[PDB]
Structure 1
């Protein structure tokens, strides 16, 4: 048994207990393609969020193969159906685990609300989607429909340990850094994890939560350029939080706010100028992004950015949604700075409720493993951790 619904009748964030073998239906189980590949079977676990239980050979054309040229490879991983089902379930469980915490509910709500802006038009009076913020969803009868989405969780490329939150860019627009945002893809595996020193293992809910925090930043187009580094990038230090984030430059973070506060006013000015759209009323999409960015509307219908709601939204995404705060809500052991990852990679299986639960992770209550983080101790609980 998986223990995917420890309390209540049904999972609270993921919409169905999928089986990889479940039939396609064009709604939440479907063959999809990323705007050329071969159709891939995907699961829609929530509004705006799809799971592709496949190795990623799609996003980067330069990464279409799974052999080698801090790392680990294995072309066997995630090639059979039992594996795709185990991964679909592992990702499911972890969403439920994250949503079982106040902070995770806040974060996943923010993500679903962060629809990528409709800035894909070359006519300033016109709202239009950007079609790289979409997937094509094949129906049972063979037809496509283009569906917008915020977040895709997909398997890793050749380098199974490399986890990242990446997205498709625009010729001219820096979508992750102008406020618009864009559809985020997280290369992630629930099937392996990292060691840190007593020799323990990182709880995979923390790691998924890390990448989601990047997804939040990137969905509201307030990411820190990856060229700003110490190499550790500012974006990584922010996402980790705790005392690592203090080292970000002083007032240049206060620059960052002003920059993106202005970027949000450029978006508000764009919504006001909108006079046409290319179904869904111009009214309806303007509201969508009113809700997203917390825009104010006057009796006249003009949009603007309230400084205080901006601050609260940009404080929420950049300082509250951190890896360190998740460590705290999860009450797990984590490395204390972004660098203290030692090079231990472990195979794990979190899907068996006997191995790890939505509420306790590995540190199973009322057992050996509940005290002193034993469940995360790769030697005490070596049952759950196979070193590579």
Structure 2
């Protein structure tokens, strides 16, 4: 509903240092970054440290692994990736829940950091990512996949040091998140491929939680111990991303249970900010954006609690399954990580033609349609446990 614009770019467009930038990466080179939406940075370059070896055995956590060096190495492929990503963001922007997620992701702002001297500093790694012309205002970064082409996860620079819910992404301090997403590679769940718009919405909800400092800690996950021993792990149940998912998966600390802390997180950050005015204003605006059209007050405890309740009610209906329910057309998997179910990575031959702005996969999401490469070029078959004795 809210009028925002995302601008389509081309990798052939030149760097004007205004909307198209160069991002300094871990390798020390520079990747042509694009601002598809205000404070939303998108780079068609893959994540750092691409594996030199293809095939073999997947890691003990994930089930489906695909690797490809040649993926996203030519400017034509980077252009294709950029157009696919712009199309996905525009499609998600068309719907009301996607529009609410994009309003916050863009209008959000991490609160300023306190130096050793005690005064607040504006230019911080929490809000800026170094480029060749100095730093720049970023809220979320979208990249290509890592070594694992299938991977789709949201990572940041702020995490709980003592494996406890007090990380930079959980204590109300903002942080910017980097997302490694690939439109061209999809995991199929029970003979149907996931719609990439839903997975991108999942990752952006995680990014928004990280941005406002209200995220469920990612230091919480339940490992699965095959035959119940520590050394043998067949997979892990990351509560952090399940909760973001809708569906029917069973989790103890729900998202509605989450944000009870917000009352106390808001009190803590208000105490931490009280010294400065500008820092206070950002936090108050941040809070106004979290609780839709409020013009909040946080002077007393009762107003704080009312505001926290307003926020919970506002951003409780931003989930994968809720987005699907808004779409109606797209079919979503029931649970999230069925430990025992088989998954078939499918690649998309022609994303530009086979996927549209209005309704992608015009032949549906069945593995046997939209010429979906049942299994993609490379694989890494799962670890094979052998049982032997008399």
Same fold (TM over 0.5): yes
Task: Please tell me whether the aligned partners of residues 193 and 204 of structure 1 are also in contact (alpha carbons under 8 angstroms).
Answer: yes
Residue equivalent to 1:333? 331
Aligned ranges 1:1-388 → 2 under 5 Å = 13-15=5-7, 17-34=8-25, 37-57=28-48, 63=49, 65=51, 67=53, 70=63, 71-138=65-132, 144-169=133-158, 174-197=167-190, 199-230=191-222, 231-244=236-249, 247-249=250-252, 256-274=258-276, 283=278, 285-294=279-288, 296-297=296-297, 306-317=304-315, 319-331=316-328, 332-340=330-338, 342-349=342-349, 351-352=351-352, 354-362=353-361, 364=362, 369=363, 375-379=364-368, 381-388=369-376
- Could you give the per-residue CA deviations for residues 69-100 of structure 1, whole angstroms, max 9, x where no partner exists? 82111101001111000000111000001011
Secondary structure of 1:262's counterpart equals: helix
Structure 1 gaps of 5+ residues are 1-10, 58-62, 139-143, 275-281, 370-374
Following superposition, the deviation at residue 248 of structure 1 comes to 2.7
1:128 Cα deviation from its structure 2 partner: 4.0
SS in 2 for 1:56: coil
Whether the 8 Å contact between 2:105 and 2:208 is mirrored in structure 1 is: yes
Q: Distance in 1 between matches of 2:78 and 2:52?
A: 16
* Equivalent residues of 2:184, 2:349 under 8 A apart: yes
Higher share in helix: 1
Q: For the residues of structure 1 that align with 2:141 and 2:52, how far apart are their CA atoms?
A: 20
Residue correspondences, number: 339
**TM-score normalised by the chain length of structure 2:** 0.79
Cα distance in 1, alignment partners of residues 286 and 219 from structure 2 = 27
- Give distance in 2, aligned partners of 1:24 and 1:53: 14
Large movers: runs of 4+ above 4 Å = 170-173, 252-255, 302-305
Distance 1:87 1:49 in 2: 16
* Mapped contact 1:67–1:158 kept (Cα < 8 A): no
Cα distance change of structure 1 residues 111 and 387 upon mapping to structure 2, 3 Å threshold: same
Unaligned runs of 5+ in 2: 57-62, 223-235, 289-294, 377-390
Structure 1 residue 336: deviation in Å?
0.7
CA gap of 1:54–1:254, structure 2 versus 1, over 3 A, is: closer
RMSD value, Cα: 2.7
Q: Secondary structure at the match of 1:344?
A: strand
Tell me how far 1:67 sits from its aligned partner: 3.5
SS at match of 1:249: coil
Q: What's the TM-score, normalizing by structure 1? A: 0.79
**Distance between the aligned counterparts of 1:224 and 1:95, measured in 2?**
24
